[PDB]
Each structure stands twice: as C-alpha cells, then as structure tokens.
Amino acid sequence: TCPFYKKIPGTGFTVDAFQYGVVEGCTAYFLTHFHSDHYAGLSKHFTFPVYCSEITGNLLKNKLHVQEQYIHPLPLDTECIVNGVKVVLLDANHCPGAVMILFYLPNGTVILHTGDFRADPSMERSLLADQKVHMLYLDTTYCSPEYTFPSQQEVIRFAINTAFEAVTLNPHALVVCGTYSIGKEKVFLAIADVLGSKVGMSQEKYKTLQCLNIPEINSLITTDMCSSLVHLLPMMQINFKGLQSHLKKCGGKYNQILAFRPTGWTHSNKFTRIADVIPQTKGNISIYGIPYSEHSSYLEMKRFVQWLKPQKIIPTVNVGTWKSRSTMEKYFREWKLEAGY
Ligand code: NI
C-alpha cells in the first residue's frame, strides 16, 4: 500500500510509487528520476501512463523495456497540462534526467515535489521565482548540521589533479572509477579528459550512458578497453581483491592502479578537508574515497527552504523512525522562526 507522502491531493497523481501494484484513483504515475529505490516495480509489463523527463523516458524504454505507448516525456521549464492539471518540470541538480515537479492544483494550492535534489542558488531564478508554494515535499537525506561536504567543483579539481600527477609520474598506471547507478559521471569524464583518453566500460554501462543526451558522448566513451587508460567497474569491485583481479586481465600493459570511489557523505568529512584526503594503499594499488554528493548539504537545504518560505513541509527521506521525524521537525521550526515566515 502506497504511503501518503507519495500521493498528490486533489489529483489523480502519484510520485515515485511503482511498487504498490495498481494505486486506487491513479490516472498518471510521475517518475522523478531513474534510481532503483524510485522506479522499484516498473518493468515491460507496466500498462499505465508514466510522466517524466526525456532522459528518464530513454532509460525506461532501453533499460527496463517499458513500451513506448505508455512513456510520456515532458520538456523542462515549460507549462504542460496533464489530465486537466497544469504542471512544470524543473532540473533537480541530481543525476541526469532528474526533475522537481510543480503542480498547480484546481483549488489554487501550489505544490513543489523536489524528488531527489541538490539545492542551488540558481533555483532561486527558475520558474519558482514567480509564485507562492503552499506544500513542499522535500528530499531530507542530509537534514542535520553534521552533514557537510565540499562543492562538486572542489571535488573534481582534487580528482583531476590527483590522477594527472600519478599518471605523469608513472605512464604505466591505470585509473579505475567505481559506479552502480547513473549520476556522478563528471568524475570519470573529467579524469579521462585531463589524461587524453576515452573512458572504457562494459557494454551494459555503455548502453546506459548512450541514453543520457550528453554532448559529443561518442567522442568520450568506448567499449574497447584496450584503447583506454580510464576504466569503469562496478562499485563492488573497488577493493584490493577486485582491483588485483582486474590488473591481471590487462595483459601486462599496467603495473599500478589508482582507483576512485565516489561516495556521498562519510564520517571522515567531520575531520578531514578535501585537500588533506589520502588513499588506502596495498602494494601497487591505491583507493581514494571522494565525497561527491548529488544531494543537498544541510546548509544548501536550509537556504533553499528559507528562500521559498513554504507553508507546510512533508519530508520524503528518513521518515521511518520517530527520532528522525522529530529531528527534522525541530529544524523546520528553527528555520521558520529565524527567517520570519
Ligand atoms: Ni536518487
């Protein structure tokens, strides 16, 4: 059974609600992004209308085989009428194709569903500038002040400088980057660009990346592993055993691995600055954990909410424990008393 924070009142609509069977009263199922916790339940046998971005709809068709007649792609930043209700899709600054959804209800209520997002001051100059929001369905993944991390631009600067230095010292070093979902593509693209290489990967990953509308992608990626000195591997393989095994397969082309694991936040962020980050090393293999987040930090979330001034907030993450719920409600009241809404 579908929980309340996935239903949009006054509509036939649900958001990210595919694992509950047929939802009573639902005439259109919105999907904010192609991450498995959110699409859980969709397959080629799905027969109700799905509304999404173009990039999400390419993934639904090619990766999950949803039939085309049920995929309804909408352009971003454009007022659209769906089943008699005005909606807009906005870029969420999450993974490729990820959207927030603005719903203009028939009674005059305006609702923003953020999906998963990384709040940014640029969102203060989107179509949100123009009008009031009564209800905010908020991605609260890192809603506590202990959650700090650097900008994506600082993290990429660290990765590129670390990879360029290592491979210039040792031309026979291979770089490996872990992945397990879409998102975070700038990590491996930025490293391969500084090295003058294509990125090498499995056929399954190449297929996924070909659905993402990245400009000049054919110039950046390949399935010919022998031609490339930046390889992608599943995230589960980014450990000393899996990397040793990979280096064997490379026919004596390389004598060292430098590997990256993009994570979200980890507790070493409470102590260590990005510039001071060091790897774990075993012989000729080194592994860097880098805190590349596609969700809001606490401070980014607080800024966005204090700017938007919603009348009511419904969290969509960390909703399963009383302690998490109580914590989040305390911070929403702090924010509201501090800003005066
Ligand atoms: Ni996500």
State how far Cα 331 lies from the chain centre. 24
**29-33 LR contacts (CB < 8 Å, sep 24+):** 30/101, 30/113, 31/56, 31/60, 32/92, 32/98, 32/99, 32/100, 32/101, 32/113, 32/115, 32/116, 33/92, 33/94, 33/95, 33/97, 33/98, 33/99, 33/115, 33/116
| Cα 100 to middle of ligand 1, angstroms | 12
| Cα 139 to middle of ligand 1, angstroms | 9
CA 252/CA 74 separation, integer angstroms: 49
Coil, helix or strand at residue 311: coil
Asked whether 291 and 264 are in contact (CB, 8 A), the reply is: yes
| Cα 293 to middle of ligand 1, angstroms | 11
CA 154/CA 313 separation, integer angstroms: 31
Give the CATH number for residue 16.
3.60.15.10
For ligand 1, a single-atom ion, which residues have Cβ within 5 Å? 35, 116
| Cα 35 to middle of ligand 1, angstroms | 5
Q: Of 155, 175, 170, 180, which is closest to residue 289 (Cα–Cα)?
A: 155
Asked whether 337 and 160 are in contact (CB, 8 A), the reply is: no
Quick one: tokens of 270?
Answer: 């409470």
The domain total for the chain is: 2
Resolution rounded to one decimal, in angstroms = 1.2
What technique solved it?
A: X-ray
Residue type, 35: H
Angle between helices 152-169 and 185-195 (to 10 degrees): 40
- Quick one: 212 and 156 in the same domain? yes
- Quick one: 8 and 131 in the same domain? yes
Which residues form the domain of 7?
A: 1-147+296-341
Q: How many CB atoms lie within 10 A of CB 269?
A: 20
| Cα 232 to middle of ligand 1, angstroms | 20
- Quick one: 155 and 259 in the same domain? yes
**CB-count burial class (<10 Å; 0-12, 13-18, 19+) for 79:** exposed
- Quick one: 1 and 122 in the same domain? yes
| Cα 117 to middle of ligand 1, angstroms | 8
CA 46/CA 6 separation, integer angstroms: 19
CA 5/CA 3 separation, integer angstroms: 6
Give the CATH number for residue 175.
3.40.50.12650
CA 329/CA 289 separation, integer angstroms: 32
| Cα 171 to middle of ligand 1, angstroms | 36
- Quick one: 49 and 154 in the same domain? no
- Quick one: 154 and 131 in the same domain? no
